[PDB]
Design goal:
This is part of a larger assembly, with chains A, B and C. Chain A is mainly alpha-helical. Helix content of chain A is 43%, strand content 9%. In chain A, the strands form 3 sheets. A 3-stranded antiparallel sheet of chain A has the order 3-5-4. In chain A, strands 1-2 form a two-stranded antiparallel ribbon. Chain A has a two-stranded antiparallel ribbon with strand order 6-7. In chain A, a hairpin with a 3-residue loop joins strand 6 and strand 7. In chain A, helix 5 packs across helix 7. Chain A is elongated. By secondary structure, chain B is mainly α. Chain B starts with a strand and ends with a helix. By secondary structure, chain C is an all-alpha fold. Chain C is 62% helix and 0% strand. Chain C contains 11 helices and no strands. Classes of the chains: A mainly alpha, B mainly alpha, C mainly alpha. At the B-C interface, loops of B face helix 4 of C. Chain C binds a DNA duplex through helix 1, helix 5 and helix 11. Chain A: It is found in: Nucleus.
Chain lengths: 246, 178, 193
Amino acid sequence: LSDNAKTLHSQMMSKGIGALFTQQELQKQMGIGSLTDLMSIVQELLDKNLIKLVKQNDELKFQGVLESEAQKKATMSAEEALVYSYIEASGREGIWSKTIKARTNLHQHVVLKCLKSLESQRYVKSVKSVKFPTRKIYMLYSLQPSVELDIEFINSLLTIVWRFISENTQEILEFITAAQVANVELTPSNIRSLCEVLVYDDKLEKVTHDCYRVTLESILQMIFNYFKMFPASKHDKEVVYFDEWT
Amino acid sequence: TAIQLKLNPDGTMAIDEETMVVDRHKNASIENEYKEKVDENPFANLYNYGSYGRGSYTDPWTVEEMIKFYKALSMWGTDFNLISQLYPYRSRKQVKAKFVNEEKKRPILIELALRSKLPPNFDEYCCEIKKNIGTVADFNEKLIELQNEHKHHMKEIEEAKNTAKEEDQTAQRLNDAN
Amino acid sequence: LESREATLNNARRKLRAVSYALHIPEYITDAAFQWYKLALANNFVQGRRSQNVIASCLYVACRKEKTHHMLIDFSSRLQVSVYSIGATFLKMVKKLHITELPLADPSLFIQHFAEKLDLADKKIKVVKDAVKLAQRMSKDWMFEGRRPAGIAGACILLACRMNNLRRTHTEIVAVSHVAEETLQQRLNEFKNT
DNA sequence: CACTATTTTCGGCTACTATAAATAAATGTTTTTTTCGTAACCCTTCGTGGACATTT
DNA sequence: AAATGTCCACGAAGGGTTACTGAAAAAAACATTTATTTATAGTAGCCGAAAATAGTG
């Protein structure tokens, strides 16, 4: 009875967590008992809340988890364990507090009181998203925020690449790695997207599908001469405006 | 109250439709059933000014507890922190109300408690240890060693956390190059 | 503001909530709102409980009318102490410069006790004898720092004493909501003046 | 008639209830922004004939 | 050179259609509670003893 369960979860511990298990291999793995008694101890082990019911698509599938985090969730009462189960089932991308309220039928107070107790027990952290901001996304402490950075100081590096070319795309990477650049990740896919910005300002030019020249706007940096045209603007009536015809 | 399954001869290893979700009321229902059933007469729920308020009635003090009090007030100066546990289900507030009480009725024994600044009749050595026999352990450093265990368990957690931080950095770089 | 309109549309449901309950007629709810409205602007509603300020605001309007309603009939619905809601009443009146005010006249409370007490159909002689007892109680020296509902809860005991056997010290306490032994002290007091 | 006994009563014990000050910090509690019926008649469709180009 | 197929356009026919008798969160603001402590008086639970008279044999 219980000794065969000690042999059952050894097989669940035998393989590293991936390559998820199912019965048609597990019956060939363990066939000392007939299926009239194989199912009974697994349903007893569902009552010992160590085996879970994973879904591989359209068909029947199992997964056995670690015991060290099984007693972690058995500390909770069944409602706190109910919200905990969905919030690890997302795992890699997080869950929204409206979606975690819909799938459980728990109304607005009883879910907001549930996770507030769960956060003190160090079992949920709160991150804000960038693909949709102003939305509360929760995760575990696995720290998987798969969702460069949206806040400014983009152009603080684009002045560096434009001073670099003005003297006259793979070479562009290694100039950025030096010179105390506050960076964390460079790739040619990014630097092309970093280069298309100054294509639109006409501060550099695209030639031969990868080469880049200066458009000589350095001489404008220093009729098409839009500085050194200072207006009168004071006590003058006959001045030309761009609006005020619409 | 976990998920249950069954062995159908037609569909083997099938999952049942009803235990998929829980009612959350049937376990509340049986809790209610062995409760007292009272027929309300409108004169029972009478309320006055002494209703929905603080406080209770303290048990009037005994001469047995006087010799546990004045000796605690002769050795210590006036230390209500440890007298509160000496009287196991009495509280910090009414022993302070007893302190102001005994000033007015017996104004001379609080002087004798103040005047005596010396070892008394040395019978309190058992009463020294009568407090010290409950859960005998060296609290001066036994509080330290399990607190050391508390930060030792935390020192596991960042190691379990920060190695879980670096597994994110290797996978999210791998699909970038892919 | 829209948020300032929305904080009184909600606060209009509160005053109509208790006035439907205590049978406050509709010319007091509308009179009560301006007392809430001036206390709204002068930074009195911030911090304190919403449901704790509106009953204290309503009692100002019920005192000015000189009506039979006490203060503890507000608090017993709210299941707090009398002294909790009474303390935020004192910080309303002296802060917001309410100088003129009616006194808690105990002769008002005799006429309203009888109707839900369900006494005999000769309900005038229990009243005509009682206010003449209260006028006798008025010149005599017992109620000056005592309770308006207290001394008016033992007169109608003694006025109905000589005619009925309604005195059992429990059906009158279920009306007056003042303790059983604090009116026997009143009956011991006036006997010996 | 003797005392038992709930009733009647004294009685004191207790415990805040306001009223003014020091912080100081913790706590909750509630607003103001910041954001997520007949009859024309246009309309729509099925359709039929004209000419152009390749091919016999 | 002619004959057939194909591309195109226009009227023919019915089709339907229109005025007729809010909540959520965040920074903001702020009273409350906690800690005294010092007098007074009533409200009240509360026992509690204890006076006392109602009452049992």
